[PDB]
RNA sequence: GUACGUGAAAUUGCUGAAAGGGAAGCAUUGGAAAUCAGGUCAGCAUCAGUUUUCGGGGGCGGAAAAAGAAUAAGGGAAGGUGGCUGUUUAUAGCCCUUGUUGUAAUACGUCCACUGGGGACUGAGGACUGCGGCUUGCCAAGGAUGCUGACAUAAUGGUUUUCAAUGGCCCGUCUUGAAACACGGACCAAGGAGUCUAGCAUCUAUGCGAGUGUUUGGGUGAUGAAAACCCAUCCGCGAAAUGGUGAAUGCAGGUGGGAACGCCCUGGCGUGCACCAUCGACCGU
RNA sequence: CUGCCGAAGUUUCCGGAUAGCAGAAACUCAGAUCAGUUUUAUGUGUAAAAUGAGAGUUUCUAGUGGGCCAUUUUUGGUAAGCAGAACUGGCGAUGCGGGAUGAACCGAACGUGAGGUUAAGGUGCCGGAAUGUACGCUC
RNA sequence: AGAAGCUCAGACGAGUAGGCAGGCGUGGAGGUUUGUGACGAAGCCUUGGGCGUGAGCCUGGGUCGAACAGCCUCUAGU
C-alpha cells in the first residue's frame, strides 16, 4: 500500500531530476554552439558546426510504380505508407540510403520541439508487436526499462540526442502517421526540393514541413 | 484502459501525467540585459562586404 | 443506445429492373467484364460484410426490441423474464380466438405486442 | 354458372394520378403530393476528442539584422542648387568614412510545458479500480453532461410516384496481350444440366486391436416378420521376409541432438519418448 | 449468399516430368538466422557493420508454362521506316482523381460512414476554386 | 460459465486461376414442439410494417377454402 506509493512518487521526482537535466543540456549546448560561433566571427574565425547523427525522413510518394530495389529499402526503413515520418541514424550508411531513394522520401534536421511534439501527439509504442499509445510513463518503463528509459522526456533526449540506444528507442517507435499538410505542398511536389520540387534533403525545413502535418 | 487517446500539448492534466517537469519550466529568461558586445572581426566584415 | 442502420435501401440484382424475368432477389455476378462487380461509377452498390450494423443493435426493431414469434399462449410465458429485450409477434395463421389470448396474456405479463391489432 | 376449385406472370381494355422539345430504364441527395410507423425536434452553457481561423504578449538568433533618425569629424562630388556653359553649400541639398546617441528600433528566422477569441464534426464506453492535479474530499485526471424550451391535429424517420442537380454505354458467350467483332437474347410462366454404381488412393471420424470383418448361409423374430436380434464352419486382409530357405549375438545394442519429468543452487546433473544422423548386428527383423 | 487465403503469367530437361510462385500437415528453432537494401575491407566479384523482420527446413497438392507496352544498353542500320537481342518495369487478377473523350500519360491503389487535409490537375463562364499579385514578350 | 461461451488490445480489408470456412432456400423420412388450422391451413395479391451485409425471414390487409409448420437429425430427381 504505502511501498507502492513511495517508491513511485520516488519515480516521478526522478524523473523530474532527469528532465530538469536534460532541458538544461539542450540550453547549454545551444548556447555554447552561439558562443563558439560569436567567438570564430570577432576573430575572423570559421566555425564548423558537428554533423547531425539525427533525420526524420518523410514518405512522400505512394505505394504505386515504384521500383523493386528502392521499394525494398522503404520496407527497411518502415516507410510502408505516404506520409509516414520515422527517426534514422544519420550516418555513412545511410546517407547511400537516402540518396538513392530521393525522389520517393524528403528528409532533414528536426529540432527539438519537432522531436517533443512528434512524441507527445504521434507518439505510439511498438508493445507485443501492437500500436500502443505512448499515454503514460509506465507503458514505456516496461518496455525500454533494460535500457533506463523510463520517461516520455527520456524516450525524447534517447532519440535527440542520439544516445547509446538510438537502435531500440527508434524501433520502440512505431512509425508516425502525419496527415497530408495543412496548405498543401508546392505546386510540384515530385521535383527535388532544391530544384523547386518537394523531394529530397531539405535540411532545417523538415521542421516547417512537420508543423505542417501536425 | 485508454480507451481515449487525449494529446498532452492541448490538455494540461495529461502533460502533467507524463511529464511530472512541466510544473517549473521558466520558458522566458532575459539574459540580454548588459552590454551587448557587438562580435564581428573588422576582416570578417571586409569579406563578408566583399566585391 | 439509438439504433442506426449502415444502409436502409436494399441491394437489387443488377438488371432486376429492365427484366421482369429477373428477379430483385440478389445475386452475385460471375461475369468477368461484369463493370457492376468492378465497382465502376454510376453502377449500383454490392453487398459487402462493411453494411453490417452494430452488434448491440443487430436484430432490434426500432423501439430497440427483438421481434420473437409466438404461436400460443405457452410460448408468450418464455418471453415473461425477456420483456425488456423481446417483443411477441404473433404468427399469421393464429386464429382470432387465440389472437385475442395471446394478447391478453401478454399484455398482463408486460410483454410488448408488434402486431397486436390484428385478426 | 358447366368458357365451372385456387386464378400467378406475359399481354390487353377502362378509370384515376402524373410525365413527355430526337430514347428509356438505373443510382445518389432532397423537395412536393400521397401514405405509414412510432416520444420527436430544437436553443444555451460547462467539458472531452479531432480540426480550422484570427489576434495579443514575451525570450533567443543574424553584420548581437541591414537600415534609419539625431548629432560631431573628414572625404568626395553630382542627375550642379543658390550663385557665376562652367563650379563644390552658399539663399537647395546629395554621396562616402568615422564617432556618437546605443545594450537604438524594426524586419526576419526561431522558441514559449505564454495567452485571448470565432466556427464546424464527434459523445464511442457504462458501479468502483488506473495514471495525475488541487488539497477526507474536489478536479478539464482510463470516451457528455447540465439547464431549459416548443410539439404531438407535428416534428423526425420512412415507403410510393414525380421533378431538379450529378452520375450511369447491353447482358451472356467467344476470340485475343487487349478490345471490337462474332454468335445468343420479342415477352412471361413451368421444366432444364457433375448424377448413380464398381475399383483404387488420401485425409477425418468411429468400433475393436495382433487381430479384425455378423447379414453366402443358418438360427430367430406373434405387436409389420424385407426390420431388429443371435453365430456354426470357412474365407478376406494383417501378423515374415527374401529369392526352396526363412530373423533379439549385444537391457530386442552404443554416440549425439531431442519431447517430458525429477533433483539442485540462469545454469548444472540424472532420466530421456517420437524422429534424424551414427558405429552395430540377425534372416527385412 | 456472404467471409477468408491467393497465384503463375516460365525457367531447366525429354505432351509431360521438374523447379518457381500459393496453401496444408508434421517437425526445430528465439545467446537464430534471414534480406530484390546500403556501407566497410580484400583483391566488378569475395568477405564482415548499418537497418528491417522471429527465422528455418521436411513431406503433398492445387493453379500457372502466354503475350502486350515502355525505358536503357547494344547489334546492324535505311531513301525514310525499322530489324535483333538483353534489361527491369507497366498492364495483365484493379476500381478511383485528373488528362474535354480513351488498354497503355500524370496521381492514387478499394470494408460502410462523419469531419479535416492534400496529390495529379486546376480557379473567365459551362465547372468546385483569385476576371489574384509582380515583371516581361506577342497583333 | 450455451468455455461451443464471455472479455481486452492491436493491425489489416481490390482480388482472376486456385484453395478454405460458415450460412440461405426446396421435396420427402425419424424424432420433437401439452405446435398452427373451417373463429380459415396452404397458395396468391398488396403505393402496409419489421428483421438480415446477403441468400432470405416474419408480419398487416385483401383473396382463398383443408391442410401446415418451428427445432434436432436423415435423405435427394434440391
Same mark, same amino acid.
Given at each position: 500500500?504505502?511501498?507502492?506509493?513511495?517508491?513511485?512518487?520516488?519515480? !516521478? @521526482? *526522478? %524523473?523530474? #531530476? =532527469?528532465?530538469?537535466?536534460?532541458?538544461?543540456?539542450? $540550453?547549454?549546448?545551444?548556447?555554447?554552439?552561439?558562443?563558439?560561433?560569436?567567438?570564430?566571427?570577432?576573430?575572423?574565425?570559421?566555425?564548423?558546426?558537428?554533423?547531425?547523427?539525427?533525420?526524420?525522413?518523410?514518405?512522400?510518394?505512394?505505394?504505386?510504380?515504384?521500383?523493386?530495389?528502392?521499394?525494398?529499402?522503404?520496407?527497411?526503413?518502415?516507410?510502408?505508407?505516404?506520409?509516414?515520418?520515422?527517426?534514422?541514424?544519420?550516418?555513412?550508411?545511410?546517407?547511400?540510403?537516402?540518396?538513392?531513394?530521393?525522389?520517393?522520401?524528403?528528409?532533414?534536421?528536426?529540432?527539438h520541439?519537432?522531436? !517533443? @511534439? *512528434? %512524441?507527445? #501527439? =504521434?507518439?505510439?509504442?511498438?508493445?507485443?508487436?501492437? $500500436?500502443?499509445?505512448?499515454?503514460?510513463?509506465?507503458?514505456?518503463?516496461?518496455?525500454?526499462?533494460?535500457?533506463?528509459?523510463?520517461?516520455?522526456?527520456?524516450?525524447?533526449?534517447?532519440?535527440?540526442?542520439?544516445?547509446?540506444n538510438?537502435?531500440?528507442?527508434?524501433?520502440?517507435?512505431?512509425?508516425?502517421?502525419?496527415?497530408?499538410?495543412?496548405?498543401?505542398w508546392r505546386?510540384?511536389?515530385?521535383?527535388?526540393?532544391?530544384?523547386?520540387?518537394?523531394?529530397?534533403?531539405?535540411?532545417?525545413?523538415?521542421?516547417?514541413?512537420v508543423?505542417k502535418?501536425? | 484502459?485508454?480507451?481515449?487517446?487525449?494529446?498532452?500539448?492541448?490538455?494540461?492534466?495529461?502533460?502533467?501525467?507524463?511529464?511530472?517537469?512541466?510544473?517549473?519550466?521558466?520558458?522566458?529568461?532575459?539574459?540580454?540585459?548588459?552590454?551587448?558586445?557587438?562580435?564581428?572581426?573588422?576582416?570578417?566584415?571586409?569579406?563578408?562586404?566583399?566585391? | 443506445?439509438?439504433?442506426?442502420?449502415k444502409?436502409?435501401?436494399?441491394?437489387?440484382?443488377?438488371?432486376?429492373?429492365?427484366?421482369?424475368?429477373?428477379?430483385?432477389?440478389?445475386?452475385?455476378?460471375?461475369?468477368?467484364?461484369?463493370?457492376?462487380?468492378?465497382?465502376?461509377?454510376?453502377?449500383?452498390?454490392?453487398?459487402?460484410?462493411?453494411?453490417?450494423?452494430?452488434?448491440?443493435?443487430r436484430?432490434?426493431?426500432?423501439?430497440?426490441?427483438?421481434?420473437?414469434?409466438?404461436?400460443?399462449?405457452?410460448?408468450?410465458?418464455?418471453?415473461?423474464?425477456?420483456?425488456?429485450?423481446?417483443?411477441?409477434?404473433?404468427?399469421?395463421?393464429?386464429?382470432?380466438?387465440?389472437?385475442?389470448?395471446?394478447?391478453?396474456?401478454?399484455?398482463?405479463?408486460?410483454?410488448?405486442?408488434?402486431?397486436?391489432?390484428?385478426?
Open positions: 500500500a504505502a511501498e507502492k506509493k513511495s517508491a513511485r512518487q520516488k519515480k !516521478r @521526482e *526522478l %524523473i523530474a #531530476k =532527469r528532465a530538469e537535466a536534460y532541458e538544461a543540456e539542450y $540550453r547549454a549546448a545551444e548556447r555554447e554552439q552561439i558562443e563558439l560561433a560569436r567567438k570564430a566571427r570577432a576573430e575572423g574565425n570559421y566555425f564548423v558546426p558537428h554533423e547531425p547523427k539525427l533525420i526524420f525522413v518523410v514518405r512522400i510518394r505512394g505505394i504505386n510504380n515504384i521500383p523493386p530495389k528502392a521499394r525494398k529499402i522503404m520496407q527497411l526503413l518502415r516507410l510502408l505508407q505516404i506520409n509516414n515520418g520515422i527517426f534514422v541514424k544519420f550516418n555513412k550508411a545511410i546517407k547511400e540510403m537516402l540518396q538513392v531513394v530521393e525522389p520517393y522520401v524528403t528528409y532533414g534536421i528536426p529540432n520541439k519537432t522531436v !517533443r @511534439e *512528434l %512524441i507527445y #501527439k =504521434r507518439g505510439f509504442g511498438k508493445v507485443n508487436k501492437q $500500436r500502443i499509445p505512448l499515454s503514460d510513463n509506465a507503458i514505456i518503463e516496461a518496455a525500454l526499462g533494460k535500457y533506463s528509459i523510463l520517461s516520455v522526456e527520456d524516450l525524447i533526449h534517447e532519440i535527440y540526442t542520439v544516445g547509446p538510438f537502435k531500440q528507442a527508434a524501433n520502440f517507435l512505431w512509425p508516425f502517421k502525419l496527415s497530408s499538410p495543412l496548405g498543401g505546386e510540384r511536389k515530385f521535383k527535388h526540393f532544391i530544384e523547386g520540387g518537394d523531394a529530397g534533403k531539405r535540411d532545417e525545413h523538415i521542421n516547417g514541413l508543423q502535418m501536425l | 484502459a485508454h480507451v481515449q487517446k487525449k494529446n498532452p500539448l492541448k490538455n494540461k492534466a495529461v502533460l502533467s501525467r507524463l511529464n511530472p517537469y512541466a510544473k517549473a519550466y521558466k520558458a522566458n529568461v532575459k539574459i540580454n540585459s548588459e552590454k551587448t558586445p557587438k562580435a564581428a572581426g573588422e576582416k570578417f566584415l571586409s569579406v563578408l562586404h566583399e566585391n | 443506445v439509438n439504433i442506426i442502420k444502409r436502409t435501401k436494399p441491394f437489387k440484382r443488377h438488371q432486376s429492373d429492365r427484366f421482369k424475368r429477373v428477379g430483385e432477389s440478389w445475386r452475385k455476378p460471375r461475369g468477368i467484364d461484369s463493370c457492376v462487380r468492378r465497382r465502376f461509377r454510376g453502377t449500383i452498390s454490392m453487398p459487402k460484410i462493411g453494411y453490417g450494423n452494430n452488434k448491440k443493435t436484430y432490434c426493431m426500432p423501439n430497440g426490441l427483438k421481434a420473437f414469434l409466438v404461436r400460443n399462449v405457452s410460448d408468450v410465458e418464455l418471453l415473461l423474464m425477456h420483456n425488456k429485450t423481446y417483443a411477441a409477434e404473433i404468427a399469421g395463421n393464429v386464429s382470432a380466438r387465440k389472437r385475442v389470448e395471446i394478447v391478453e396474456k401478454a399484455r398482463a405479463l408486460g410483454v410488448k405486442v408488434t402486431n397486436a391489432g390484428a385478426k
